[PDB]
Structure formats: structure tokens, C-alpha cells
Symmetry: D2
Subunit: 326 residues, 4 copies
Amino acid sequence: KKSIYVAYTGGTIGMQRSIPVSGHLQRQLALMPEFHRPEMPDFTIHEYTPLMDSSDMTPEDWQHIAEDIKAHYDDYDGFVILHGTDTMAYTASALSFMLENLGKPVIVTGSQIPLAELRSDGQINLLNALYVAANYPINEVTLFFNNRLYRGNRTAKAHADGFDAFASPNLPPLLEAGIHIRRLNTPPAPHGEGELIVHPITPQPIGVVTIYPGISADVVRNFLRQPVKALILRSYGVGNAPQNKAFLQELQEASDRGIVVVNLTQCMSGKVNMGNALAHAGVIGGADMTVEATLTKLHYLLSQELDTETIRKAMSQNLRGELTPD
Amino acid sequence: KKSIYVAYTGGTIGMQRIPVSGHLQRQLALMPEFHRPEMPDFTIHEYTPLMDSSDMTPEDWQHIAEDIKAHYDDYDGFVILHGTDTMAYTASALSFMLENLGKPVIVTGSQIPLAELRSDGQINLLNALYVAANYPINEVTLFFNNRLYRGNRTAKAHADGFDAFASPNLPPLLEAGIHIRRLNTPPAPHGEGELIVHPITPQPIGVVTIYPGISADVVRNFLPVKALILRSYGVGNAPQNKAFLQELQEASDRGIVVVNLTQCMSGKVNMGNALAHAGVIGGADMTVEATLTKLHYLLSQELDTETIRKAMSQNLRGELTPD
Amino acid sequence: LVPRGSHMQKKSIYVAYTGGTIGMQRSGHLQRQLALMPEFHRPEMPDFTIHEYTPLMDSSDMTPEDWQHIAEDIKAHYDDYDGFVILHGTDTMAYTASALSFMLENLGKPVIVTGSQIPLAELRSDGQINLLNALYVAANYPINEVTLFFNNRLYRGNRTAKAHADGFDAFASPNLPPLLEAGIHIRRLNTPPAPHGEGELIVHPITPQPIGVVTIYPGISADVVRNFLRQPVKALILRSYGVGNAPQNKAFLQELQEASDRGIVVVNLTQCMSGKVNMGGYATGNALAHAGVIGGADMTVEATLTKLHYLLSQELDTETIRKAMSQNLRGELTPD
Amino acid sequence: LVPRGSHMQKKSIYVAYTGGTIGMQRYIPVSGHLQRQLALMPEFHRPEMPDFTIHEYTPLMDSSDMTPEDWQHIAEDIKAHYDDYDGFVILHGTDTMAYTASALSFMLENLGKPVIVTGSQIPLAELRSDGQINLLNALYVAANYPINEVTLFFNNRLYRGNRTAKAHADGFDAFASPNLPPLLEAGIHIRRLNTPPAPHGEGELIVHPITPQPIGVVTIYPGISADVVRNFLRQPVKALILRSYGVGNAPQNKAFLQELQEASDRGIVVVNLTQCMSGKVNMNALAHAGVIGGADMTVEATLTKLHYLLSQELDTETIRKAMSQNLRGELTPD
Ligand SMILES: NC(=O)C[C@H](N)C(=O)O
Ligand SMILES: NC(=O)C[C@H](N)C(=O)O
Ligand SMILES: NC(=O)C[C@H](N)C(=O)O
Ligand SMILES: NC(=O)C[C@H](N)C(=O)O
Ligand SMILES: [Cl-]
Ligand SMILES: [Cl-]
Ligand SMILES: [Cl-]
Ligand SMILES: [Cl-]
Ligand SMILES: [Cl-]
Ligand SMILES: [Cl-]
Ligand SMILES: [Cl-]
Ligand SMILES: [Cl-]
Ligand SMILES: [Cl-]
Ligand SMILES: [Cl-]
């Protein structure tokens, strides 16, 4: 039998109506017979302490997860991370950067309704992720939800109230479950062979600016003066912003102070393609990356001992399948 | 039949290679389908200057609303040609500024210029004209890729696609195929009486995205600001960070209107009731486009902070779904 | 909108276990499996009673006598329960839902057909969730129509078709939106109501009736129509192209006109997954209509087959059947 | 993924104008009308466009009146012009466009130039027509994205022709490819999907001609009997397509199975498809009765594949095998 490790980090899946209650998720799984059917892999559940609402997660929580995977890596055939839905895509994106040369599947899942509440998706998303980790292994950080497996660094929580909570707007899913499980012909991510390398991260102050009609030079000035190390712009369309000379001079001053300024689309899908004023102002195009990928990629790259110039070039390069190259 | 007014404000649809005055109208004169018997009569007004929609300011919404007001009595319907990058903001703003609207106002444009090969500009404009004449809905709407959406429900979702706009929390109002079908989407609250056009004045508003590792400093900075939109996780959650929550209550105690929306493409905010205790108002399933233009509208009127806070959670123009 | 019913009293739902994939094994097996699944016994759930059919049937072996058996079992238990779930094989579930819609007049309680693509006994079963949702919907959202619940959506039965053979989203309603969608919350869609009678349930008989189903395709001959004009045939369904077009061939049109002359009901449908028949649009006259073919609007083949079974089994003459076939009787078609 | 061809030389595309809604006027064909409307539309004459030559068929046909002889006529027209043009666009009525595209896929072997079938739901230059954009796109794809397959272009997607079906009678998105992603999608940019390649031969184009073949199309529905089947045996029939439930299920009662086994004993090729819009046949029982599974083929691909194979001097065993084999990209192997 394959053996799967399950990191139970918290989230809706394990909660009760009144809140997280320690031991409750595992008491439920003990009284559902589907989990110890002979077709199932063996699995072990590690309950984290404390159990966290994913909306309370900080980048240091990504580290604690990556180090948990690293400790268990040699002893199991694959890894399932149970997680709250609110920041699931940010965790899946972070783990894709931090886990280099990954040689076993890592699948992040959870539920929109608690295992404890009626009509829960928990039992079905967990059973599917175990079965998929054992039988259809893909050596990438993935997110499994509502009968699809997505590349983790391509995912976004798209549908706050739906069982189809997550989308992968710029990439098809990797696998789809029906009567059969079907691997799709989605191109593989760049994929290192060799020993697993797990990259620690350190806190990094990053701002996220949304472009909208009437935005002022003040917000950029704002982030210049509380030293941020990086600024993500959610720009219109394929990466457009108002022509405003004061706005542009603040972006230019940020880059002159060594702040990494990255331009993403605010649209749910599409690719940035930016005379060329933002570029003139030292802004880097983020291609079709999500904000989740872009933020976690910055945490990854700022934590390594890299020059601003090296970081600015690495931000537009496909490191782990997060973006579609030219 | 009918007579349709066309406001050509700028945008991709009219560009070459750069907007160029007279290029859109020179192109339409060489395409027979427009002047054809089953079409309505229409007139194009070219704005001066023509604008990339990414350069629009809230004052540009006022110029468009006032243009519609001047033309309202003399035409059966109104088509607004606009760049795609901020089309949903303009459609949202016009829905609040135009009260008791009694004729269709449809915003459209193209993802490829009329002058480029494979342009969608001809078909989106012809469809808008035909629908404003023959299938009038008395609301501000956005027509794109064979669907008509409620304008204050729209968002530019697909930067590279012909299907560039979505209405994530509301089905379209109409769909075009061999026939044009009205869908059974519930009507918006709709005043009858004389058109009223609400002018707006500049208002400083900030837009904060919640993400892992956000600090209290962002909120502390915005504390030159009359309102703050939070793009929260899921159904409206944010980290429990006491410093963060203390800056939000300090914002609300200084009379700043703080509105919680979802960062998800679709869903409804339903908010330890910590944000609400910190004076944050839930914005239900409103888009950022609708919330931002609704705050410009309400802050421009003679209303105190408490009336604006109450109005932000009410369905004024079909922008949100009650209870 | 579908009604939001009171939750104040504990409901009792009758489950007609007809057979299907849900109860199968690699019997009494379904009922023991539900006893062992604690979700089915929570305070928030309705009480339910399973009637296991003898024998249990693969839905591929269903006939119209089976639709009648199920209608009789609903009528037998109607006054005793608050609603009905029909557990059924996926292959012909849309035919059954469509038939029940026409047979059950003055229906004042929900009837929901469901099942699963994978057996409850197998890993990755959808049966637990489709059945649990059906029971919870029958108790709490008690729409007085025959409906079909699959993969978090409730559909009007007589608008459904099995569209995806391998998918958990097996069913669609190609010409009407779903009545209800389930997520964190159960949402009711603006779907306008079907025609509704009043008083005690009346079950209209549905008998076996010889009906031929002709697919129009390039190279089809006059001999196919001539072939069905032999033996008993009472009605023909033409699966035509697009908005209802067929070859303009004189032998073909003459064989069709011969059929309507002899009292055969000939109904024109689209072969397409969605859209609406509108005859005569792409040549000068209206050739099929002049041959006495009746337009079936946007009906599915499932709805059309069961509607003909229903109307031929009633006390109606040929002219009245022809007229009724293009009339919206139960929400199966969208009027002009 | 579809090739991105050179733009350096001006291409020449041949347009087979068979008929169809695209060229009609108010509900009738008129000779010369489509060609004059195109002369009058500047976008078709821009420098970035290929050169094109229209052959107007006589008479122009409603595609609902097409027979298999019409597939033969189109294949021969392609073969007659093949060396002279860089690509081929077939303008056609929507109703049977998917059957034509399927038929051409089997009939054309060693195809080294694109062949794209397109048309419109509304007649050209008629209000709200999709004909200008479906034809402009087909010509630009044929010139620039020269996939060596028979394809179908509609509503900003290029589909593999022998995977397509008219799914939406009233919609501008009329066609679907339910069991394969599209080859190409058009937006601001033309995107190629990495849809893997069909089998490709090499050398000069070879046309595999067809000759009439009586084929029956049986829908499985509740109450169908061994007699309904025995009736399909009471004409000249050489092959029977069953549109079975779900993953290829039919009544398992002994009469029905004996009737199907008698059909196969008489040398009839009986092929089992799903009646579903998507999915794959997976059947003892029917197999024991001589029935061949058609995997995830459409009815359009199965019917045209049988016209191709039955018109060849092949024994029944060889045609049965060939029916379950992926010859042109029409089906997904196990
Ligand atoms: N997750 C995403 O990045 C979606 C979208 N680009 C946004 O800016 O929120
Ligand atoms: N237009 C929208 O508001 C989409 C999404 N709620 C966002 O925060 O960007
Ligand atoms: N179920 C349906 O009726 C779909 C399609 N009209 C068919 O002819 O099978
Ligand atoms: N075109 C198709 O084959 C769709 C569906 N399998 C049918 O039987 O019609
Ligand atoms: Cl949602
Ligand atoms: Cl790697
Ligand atoms: Cl896009
Ligand atoms: Cl003004
Ligand atoms: Cl109850
Ligand atoms: Cl499927
Ligand atoms: Cl349709
Ligand atoms: Cl001339
Ligand atoms: Cl060219
Ligand atoms: Cl050769």
C-alpha cells in the first residue's frame, strides 16, 4: 500500500458550530468507513498546534508547513495539506517556490463547509486527495478541489460561496475526476531532479496597490517612506495605469531606492504586456501571474541573498510553472 | 424609426497603429451594415479630447452623465463607446448618477481597434444600437460579446479575451444568437419620474487588499481620506491582528467610511464579530467598481457619515443582492 | 423561485429505491450502508423510509411499464409522506423524471429523482452527497414538480438529459436554468413556474406505445420512414438539423405526409443539445409543416417521447394530440 | 500545438463556396451575392490578409440537403486545386457542417495544407451576421496557423473537424468538440492549445473516394424492442450505429441481444456509441453479440468513418477492427 502524510493545519474542514476543536476532525473520520476501504492508501494525520483559521496565516506559517513536509519527506509517498480555504492558494503558491526538486506529490485541500456541518465537501475532497496522491502522483505542489487538481501557484479562490471555490484562470487543471481519473495534457512545470531543497523565508514588508480611477501619488509615497522592499501593482487590462506625472515619479523614486515594483493584471485572467511609461519608471511585468504567486515569489526571492537586479529579472522568469513565458 | 445617440469617449475601438480624431467615423462610412434599413438612425459625438480609458478620473464620469442629460429628450436610447480598461467603472458610476432612468444606456467598446484586423468593434457597436432600439431595458448596461450585463454588476475579467467582461453575481439581462432573448433576471429597483442627474465632486478613497503579512501601517497611512474599501478573504475575513483592528476603529471614529468586500470574483460578504465591532460595514456581493462609484456618488451629496454607512449596504440600483 | 419551506416540524421522506449504480457492488446493501453513515441521522435531516424494489433494475432495462410502477408507488404513499426521492440508475433517469412529470397531475409535494455515477460501495462515490442533498431539498425546498438532483443542482425533470457519460455533472438542462444550486447556502433561481393543478393527486396512465425515433443524417432514405409506417407505429420523433431542418427530397416529404395522413403524430425536434425548432426558415415555403409535421419547440427527446406516451395513453383524438404536443403542459417547453 | 507559419510571403487561399446561410438573402441562395458583399468589405483586402479565390458551387446548397456524394464532390475539388493554393476554406451551411468536416478527415490522406470548414448562423452583411468574422478568421488562420488537418472554425475557436458537433442550434457558439479541447482560440492574440497530433502520412494528397452505403442510426430509448431492430435489418443495411445510454449500455434482454447477434452474423457492422454529448463507451453481453465499441466518437465521425471504410475492399473483420482504431484523431485510444 502507499502511505500518505496528512498535515491538518486547520480550516473550515475541522471546525464545529457554537470554532476549531482539537481531535474533532479525526473523531469524525473514525466513524466514516470509506477511509479504511482496502483500495485506500494508508494515511497518518498530524494535527497542528494551534489549529489556525487560514485568514490568520502569516508568511512564517508557510515556513512551518514547508519544514513539516521536509521532516516527513523520506517516510511517505505523498503529502496532503488540510487547510482553510481563505488563503489556501497563497499557501499552495508559497510551497511551490520553497520546495525545490520536489519528487513526491504535495496536495493542498480543505472544505467550504465543515466535516461537522451537514452537506460538507470535506470527506470527498480529502478522500480524493489521498487517492490521487497514492495513484496519480504529480510531483508538483497542487490544490485539489471539487473533482479538479490545479497547479498550486496558478490557483485563486474565485467563488467565495461555491463548492467550486478555486479557479486556475491562466492554466487548465492537471487532472479531472469522474467515473475515471483523467491526467490532462497540461504542459509540465520546469522541474528539478536531485535532492529535495527546502528554502526558508524571513519576514518581508510588501505592499499591494490596486489601480482605480482617482488613485493619487500619495499611496506610493506612503509605501516609499515605511521601507517596503516590494510593491505589487494590480493594473488595468494588460497592465495599464493612468499617465499622471506625479504617480509615475513616485514609482520611479521607489525603484531608485531599490524597491522591486511588479505590474500584474487586476483581471481574473490575462497577461501583462506593458512609448512605455511604467517600464520607463522601472516597473517589471509580472506576465500572467496571480497576486498569490507574485506575493509568495517575492517572499521566496527577497529571502535568498539576491541583488535587487537579480530579483527584478527572476520575477518575470518561469521558476515553477507560475507563468507562461514569451 | 428609432434614433440612438452615440457618445464616442475614446478607447481601443477608435485607435490606429494612438487615438486619431475622425478615424472611427471614416471607417463606419465604408461599412454598409450600419446605414441599412433595419438599423436605427444614429448620431456619433466624438469627445474632445479622446481618452484611453486607463486615464479616466471620476470627473470624466460626470462629463459623460451630463452629456447624456443634455441629449436625453432627443433620442430613444444611448450608446457609450469606451475603452475596456475602466468600462465597468464608468457603467457602475452612471448607474448611480442617473436616477429614474427611462431609456436604455448601453456602454460598449472593443478589445481590438476598428482599424486592426479581427476587430470586435463593428459587431459590439451594431449590437448595442440594435438592442437599444429593439430590446430597450431602462438601466445602465454593458454590451459585450453577445451579452448585455447590468453595468453596476460588471467587471473586466478576461484581459486578452473577446469575452472580456463578466457579471459574477448576476446573470446577464439579454443574450444574442439567431434571436435576441431577454433572460428572466430580476429587474433592478427602478424609479419612475423625471430623470435626475447627480453631480459628483472629487473624493479621496483608498483600496486596501488583505493578504498574508499585511501590517497596521497601511491603514495608519490612509488615516487625506474619506473612505476605505477592504478586499477581504472569502466571505469577508481578515487576520485577527489587534494593531490592524485598532487602526480600522480609529479610521471609523474619525468619520471614515470603511466597507468590506470580497477579493473573490464571486460571493457575498457575511462577516469574534471583530470587523463589525471595529465599525466596518459589509458590502454584500458588490464589485469594487460598484462600491468605489457608489462612495463617489454618496460622498458628493449632503449626507452625514451615518447615512452613507447605512446606504452602502442598501440595494440602490441593482448593484447588490439583499439579505 | 422554488419555495423555502418551514423547518419547524421533522419531515418524513419516502425513498423509492428502484435500482441503479448507487446500490451496486464490485440486496439490502444500500439500506445497511445508510444506517452506517452518521450524516443521514443528524437532527437537521428529515426522517426517511426506503422501499427497495424487487427486483432492483439497471435503468438501461427500463420500459414505460416501469414509469407506471413508480407513479403507482408515489400515489400509494402520497398522503403518508411529505416528499418522495426516486433513487434510479443514471442511464434513463431523465426519461423517468420526464414521464412522471406528465403522469402526476395535481402534484402538491416534491418528487426528486437522483442517483450516482459511482456506487455507494465503491471509493469516490457521489451517491452519499446526491442522496443526502435530495433528502434535504425534499424536506426544506419543497417545489411541487418532478425534479432531478445531481452534483449540487436541482433541475426541472422534463428539461433534463444525461449529457456527460463520464462526469459527476452527468445531467444538464440545456434550455432552462436549474431551479436551485447548492453551495455554502442553498440558492433558488428566478426560474418561472410550471402549470399547476389543485386537489388530490391524479395519476394518468402511461402505456407502451409504438414510437419511432428517426435521426436525420446525410444519406438517410425514404425507406426509413416507409420502414416505420410498417408494424404498429403511432408517432415518429424526427431528430432534425439545427432549428428543425431536413432534406427537401419529394419521396421523403411524401412518406412523411403519408404518415400524418394515416393518423401518425410526427414531431420535429432538434438533434442539437440546445435550441428551439422553428421550421421553414431556409427555403421559400414551410415544407415539413405542409407535410403535417408538428414543431416540438425546445423539447428534449426525453420529454417528447414521454409526452407522446402520455397523450396517446389518454382519451384524446389525433388532432388534439397534435395540438397538445406544441403546448406547454408541465414546463417542458418555452412558448412563443 | 498547431504550427505558427511564416508571414513572410502573401498566401493564396481557395474558398469552396458550397452554399449555406452565410450567402443567403431575404431565406434563399442568390448566385454572386456573397462574392460581391466580400468585394465591398474592406477588411478582406488589407495587406495583412491572404489573397483568396472563391469557387461558387452550382447549385448552392442548403446543408440540410447534403448527401455523401456532396462530401465526394468537395474532396475532389480540394484534390483538383491542391497544388495551386496554400490552404482551403470550405464555406458551408451549419446544419451538416460537422458531418462534412468529419468526412473530409477520413477521405483526405497525406494532407499537408490546412482545410477549414466555416459558415455562419446569420447571413452575411445581414444585421448581426457572424459571417464576416468567421470567414475573416478562417482565411487568416489558414494563411498563418496552417494545421495539416481538416478543421472547423466557428466563434473564435478552431476545432478538429472529426471531433465536432452542432451543439447549440440558436447560438453563435453553434459548434462544440465535447471530447477534445479546441486546437486554437482567438482573442487579442491567437493562442495554440497543446492538443496532441493526429496520425499524419507523407507525400502527395490521396483522396479515398466513397460510394453509397446504407447505414442505420438507432437511438436506444425505454420501450425499444428486438422488433424495432429487426426492422432496421429489413432494408439494405450494411452498418448500424447504436446511440446507447451512458457508457454504452442497452437493454440486456435476450431477444434484443439475439437480434444484434443475427445482424453481425449477416456481416452488418454494429457500432456502439454514447447518446450523451460527452464520454466514452466502455462495455460481455453486447461484445458477446458482435457489437464494436466506438469509444468517444461522435455520430458524425462514426457515420463518415463507416462511409470511408465500407467503400473500401475490406472484409468485415478488418472494418470492425478499424472502427475502434484512431485513424484520424477522431477517438481517444485506451
Ligand atoms: N488571484 C488573482 O490574482 C486574480 C486577480 N488577478 C487579482 O488581481 O485579484
Ligand atoms: N471586480 C471585482 O470586484 C472582482 C473582485 N471582487 C475584486 O476584488 O477585484
Ligand atoms: N436529450 C436531448 O434531447 C438532446 C438532443 N436534442 C438529442 O436529440 O439527443
Ligand atoms: N454529435 C454527437 O454525436 C452527440 C451525441 N453523441 C449524439 O448521439 O448525438
Ligand atoms: Cl460564489
Ligand atoms: Cl523544481
Ligand atoms: Cl484572458
Ligand atoms: Cl460636467
Ligand atoms: Cl426535516
Ligand atoms: Cl463525460
Ligand atoms: Cl441554442
Ligand atoms: Cl464596383
Ligand atoms: Cl498572407
Ligand atoms: Cl508522393
